[PDB]
DNA sequence: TAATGCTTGTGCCTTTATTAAAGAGGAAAGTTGCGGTGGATTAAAGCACCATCGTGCGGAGAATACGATAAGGCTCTTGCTTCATTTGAAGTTATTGACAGTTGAATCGAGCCGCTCAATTGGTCAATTATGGAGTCAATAAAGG
DNA sequence: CCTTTATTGACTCCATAATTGACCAATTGAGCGGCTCGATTCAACTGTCAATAACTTCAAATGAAGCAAGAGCCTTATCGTATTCTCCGCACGATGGTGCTTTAATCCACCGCAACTTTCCTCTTTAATAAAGGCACAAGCATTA
């Protein structure tokens, strides 16, 4: 049967997701996670929907930028696979 | 009655900007009219630059409307606006780029 | 309670630049926010400049210096040109 | 609410890495990303809840989120 | 022209914490600059808070919120405790 | 006459801080007295913390005066002060550290 | 004044690298460092000269340098 | 004769210069360079001495921090020698 | 190269929903005058910044011998990619019900303005003690054995 | 581990410079009162947020199998490093000369405040046309030979 070598479908997904503009994480799990996190600061809080949407957009943008930095760090060390050490190095140089 | 905007040859409002500047001043400050004229002119210039680039990007894609994607493309394709505007645009995506060593 | 925005003037400028291109509501909101941010930066820098030199009045000189401090290079030069032209036209009218 | 951090599935992280131009991914990346996202959310939500508490309210508003993001140099357009 | 600094009060605090330790002029200038920076940040945040909620006057509530926003964690908690104690002593005196 | 500082039990000046706040206020705002008391208390607290750490660092080196080096050591050795104070200290140097792989 | 960038000798760059914990140094590092230092100085000096010009003066003051440094998030203590 | 292995005197200099607090670049060349750079923005400028001193301190602090970042980038790639590519990577992640 | 599966770019129907156009009203900008504070102009005097010499010494430049590090090549296996089957939870739609946000008055409390008093804080001067230089001794580490 | 040699911490003494205490002045904070606006409390409307069921179907979990990428080991040659000799320009110490900064008085000019008029900018209602979904589909790439 038809099969593709590793890395081809990955490149197709890279090209497809760099052209779209939609959100990539599901909404209900994110809202539940945000509510659980906010539980630790004040009890019985209520959330407006646009607040959760804004949080999701900001978080996704942050993660995409961090992954770009991680990819640079991984290429510098003669690799194509990203590892936690690259994330740690990027976060350390950024000052976080 | 002749508006200050038509006197200075602008499209942006001069009186509104002067009122906002007067509101935002600190501890018995004063604002002249030339300050409002200067500020309105610069705001109009920046708006025209961004809109021109966005419209060119929109025409490149054969559409008749401007969306956040076109603003993102126009801003990230220009170094001066890239330095000036560091904020995040909702629904803009990213600029398509791929590394040479990954291909 | 009415809300104040810049949509009318952004539409005027757009129809000046591209007569046959429209704009959506989300893009208009984004442009409004961007204009507000720029105005914030300019006013902040002008206030700081007035504080440093011990002069309580904001003049076009303070605006010009703030513009030179905030915008980069060619943007700053062209913006200064437009501002000076507008001030000269206003005074001569 | 408990154990909701696992609701950020591995396919979502893979899609986020794809949008960033990543070609191959290891196995501990998902746990690392979950921790990083938790820290970021904690900071932003703390600031937003402080803004909400000052105004003597009980509901979190999108403008509180906008201000909290702007405080950390992460200005966002399209919700203000 | 006389120049205003915090050197006398820094000396008083130092003699409170370490009765037998001195300080040089460079260190005292550095501390003066640091105190000025902190005061600037606090005043800035308080003004922004007053602007957001449409309240013209600055109260200890605005200062407390600004302190919670500016200082981190245990520093903020202890500073809030000291400020509340000082305000209570002032009012009860 | 009883000073506000002695009334609140502080070493820092309350009247000076109130005057500075009034000077720095925006567009005919108002400032209460409790705000000045709170601000003076917090400034005193921060000063005491930094001075205590610096004095301990000075005593570690068997000297009797504080220099910029001691301030640098005290600030960089504490995580909260490291986060709060990002500035550069003239004549402070660096914290001695050598990576393990270089030895 | 011409060709004064070469007045930053390589022993000085070596000492600056030593203070930062560096053990070995290549050959093009000196040219790279000279370029980086030139860019940094250009930015700061441009801002300082703008501050000086606004005040209708002809001499550059240390406070102009302090303000210019603070503008780019490089606050300095000990000269203000 | 008596000689030392490479890297021993380097470690001694690392320990020596991390303990002192003095300026490391000569003053007259730096002053000349600053004057030459400022020549391009305004003609016939005068400089106050404390201004040149402040510029020197800021520049030295900046260079030391950048070299620390470069050392981290070099260690990540399994090396002890720093190269221009490490400086480029550090400056790219920093956002410069 | 080559066919061939396979996924994407292009043309067309739909239909729809989203932007362009019109309307009432109410909120703000333009007009005119009056006073009083802030910016621009000019002269003086003093301080600060630039240019000159001498010098003499510690640091910088160039050559040298060489040991250690970066770079390239090969093996290899373990971990990450691709594909199917089954399921389970997110997304859509409609519905209740109560809680919390918003607006409008009334009212008490607190901050600002204004002149006087006197105590507090800034600048100048002599000193004494903590600190840097210089010499010396002992403890420690490194290169070869 | 041992021996020899270079390096640096610890001790002592000496000089010195730089932080402390004292005294004069000049500056502003405290005090008292009058007044006017702003934060606080209470009630009523009502917008919307949380909780419920019913249903579908599409994406997430798990497993099998496969393939290529990271990691380890070995070799080489070239390139930064430690050392010595020579010289060169920087830093220290006085000395002029001048030009640029700051201060003080003066004049004028221009901006804020206040009431009135009008016109333009902002929520509400309708639509019409540009864009996403679906279908059909040509063509350019990927794969084994």
**What φ, ψ does residue F59 adopt, rounded to 5°?**
-65, -25
Q: Are C39 and B20 in contact (CB under 8 A)?
A: yes
F32 near E CB under 8 A = yes
Distance of alpha carbon A60 from alpha carbon A58, whole angstroms: 6
Which among B63, B59, B69, B66 is positioned nearest to B94, based on CA atoms?
B69
The candidate with the shortest Cα–Cα distance to A45, out of A53, A57, A37, is: A37
Residue spans per domain, chain F: 4-102
Structure tokens belonging to residue C67: 């513009």
Which residues in chain G (41-70) have CB-CB distances under 8 A to chain H?
41-42, 44-46, 48-49, 52-53, 58-62, 64-66, 69
Q: Which residues of B touch A15 (CB under 8 A)?
A: 96, 98
Annotated resolution, angstroms: 2.7
Please state whether at least 3 CB pairs lie below 8 Å between chains D and H: no
Architecture of domain G7-71: Orthogonal Bundle (1.10)
Structure tokens at G66: 């302090």
Distance from CA of G13 to the nearest CA of C (A): 31
The burial class, CB within 10 Å (0-12 / 13-18 / 19+), for C1 is exposed
Which helix (H) or strand (E) element contains residue G77?
strand G76-77
Q: Which residue has the tokens 């409004």?
A: C32
Residues 30-69 of B with CB under 7 A from strand J: 30-33, 63-65, 67
CATH H superfamily, domain F4-102: Histone, subunit A (1.10.20.10)
Contacts of D10 (CB under 8 A, 6+ apart): D30
Chain E segment 15-74 residues within 8 A of D by beta carbon are 49, 52-53, 61-62, 65, 68-69
Q: Is the CB of G6 under 7 A from strand J?
A: no
Alpha carbons D60 and A17: distance in angstroms, whole number: 32
| CB of B78 closer than 8 Å to CB of B43 | no
Tokens of H76: 């990540």
* Residue D36 vs residues C41, D30, D32, G20, H87: alpha-carbon distances, Å: 31, 10, 6, 29, 26
Q: Which of C61, C62, C65 is closest, CB to CB, to G50?
A: C65
Question: Do C53 and G55 contact (CB within 8 A), yes or no?
Answer: yes
According to DSSP, residue B44 is labeled: H
What is the enclosing helix (H) or strand (E) of C50?
helix C25-52
- Torsion angle defined by CA atoms of residues B32, B34, B40 and B46, in that order, rounded to the nearest 10 degrees: -120
Count the neighbouring beta carbons within 10 Å of the beta carbon of residue G63.
19
The architecture in CATH of the region B4-84 reads Orthogonal Bundle (1.10)
Which residues contact residue G5 at a Cβ distance below 8 angstroms, ignoring those fewer than 6 apart? G34, G38, H33
Determine, for residues D76 and B87 on separate chains, whether the beta-carbon distance falls below 8 Å: yes
> CB–CB of F25/B28 below 8 Å?
no
Burial of H86 (0-12, 13-18, 19+ CB in 10 A): buried
Contact E40, G75 (CB under 8 A): no
Residue D46, burial from CB neighbour count under 10 angstroms (0-12, 13-18, 19+) = middle
> D5-71 has which fold?
Histone, subunit A (1.10.20)
| Interatomic distance H91 CA / I35 C1' (Å) | 59
Residue nearest the C1' of I90 (CA based): A28
- Distance, CA of A33 to chain centre: 15
What residue segments make up the domains of chain A, in order of their start? 8-94
Asked whether the beta carbons of H20 and F68 are under 8 A apart, the reply is no
> How is domain A8-94 classified at the CATH fold level?
Histone, subunit A (1.10.20)
Residue C62 contacts B, CB cutoff 8 Å: yes
Write the DSSP assignment of A2-70 as a string of letters: ----TTHHHHHHHHHHTT--S--S-HHHHHHHHHHHHTTTSSS-EE-HHHHHHHHHHHHHHHHHHHHHH
Question: In Å, how far are A67, D1, E30, F80 from D40, measured between CA atoms?
Answer: 15, 19, 33, 18
CB A59 within 8 A of CB D40: yes
How was this one solved? cryo-EM
Indicate the pairing of strand G24-25 with strand H81-82: parallel
Domains of chain C: 7-92 (1.10.20.10)
Q: By CA distance, what is A61's nearest residue in B?
A: B88
């Amino acid at each position: 049967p038809h099969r593709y070598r590793p890395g081809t479908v990955a490149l197709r997904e890279i090209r497809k997701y760099q052209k779209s503009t939609e959100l990539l994480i599901r909404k209900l799990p994110f809202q539940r996670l945000v509510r659980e996190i906010a539980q630790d600061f004040k009890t019985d809080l209520r959330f407006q929907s646009h607040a959760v949407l804004a949080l999701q957009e900001a978080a996704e943008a942050y993660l995409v930028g961090l992954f770009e930095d991680t990819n640079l760090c991984a290429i510098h060390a003669k690799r194509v696979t990203i590892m936690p050490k690259d994330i740690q190095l990027a976060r350390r140089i950024r000052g976080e | 009655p002749i508006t200050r905007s038509s006197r200075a040859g602008l499209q942006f409002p001069v009186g509104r900007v002067h009122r906002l500047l007067k509101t935002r001043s600190t501890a018995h400050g004063r604002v002249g009219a030339t300050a409002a004229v200067y500020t309105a002119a610069i705001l109009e210039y920046l708006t025209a630059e961004v809109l021109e680039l966005a419209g060119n990007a929109s025409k490149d894609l054969k559409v008749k409307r401007i969306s956040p994607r076109h603003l993102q493309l126009a801003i990230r394709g220009d170094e001066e606006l890239d330095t000036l505007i560091k904020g995040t645009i909702a629904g803009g995506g990213v600029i398509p780029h791929i590394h040479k060593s990954l291909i | 309670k009415n809300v104040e925005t810049y949509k009318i003037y952004i539409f005027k400028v757009l129809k000046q630049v591209h007569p046959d291109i429209g704009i959506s509501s989300k893009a208009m909101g984004i442009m409004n926010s961007f204009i507000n941010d720029i105005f914030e930066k300019l006013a902040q820098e002008s206030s700081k400049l007035a504080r440093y030199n011990k002069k309580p009045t904001i003049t076009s000189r303070e605006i010009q210096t703030a513009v030179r401090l905030v915008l980069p290079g060619e943007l700053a030069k062209h913006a200064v040109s437009e501002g000076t032209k507008a001030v000269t036209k206003f005074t001569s009218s | 609410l408990r154990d909701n951090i696992q609701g950020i599935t591995k396919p979502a992280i893979r899609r986020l890495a794809r949008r960033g131009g990543v070609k191959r991914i290891s196995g501990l990346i998902y746990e690392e990303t979950r921790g990083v996202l938790k820290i970021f959310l904690e900071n932003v939500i703390r600031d937003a809840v402080t803004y909400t508490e000052h105004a003597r309210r009980k509901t979190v508003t999108a403008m509180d989120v906008v201000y909290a993001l702007k405080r950390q140099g992460r200005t966002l357009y399209g919700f203000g």
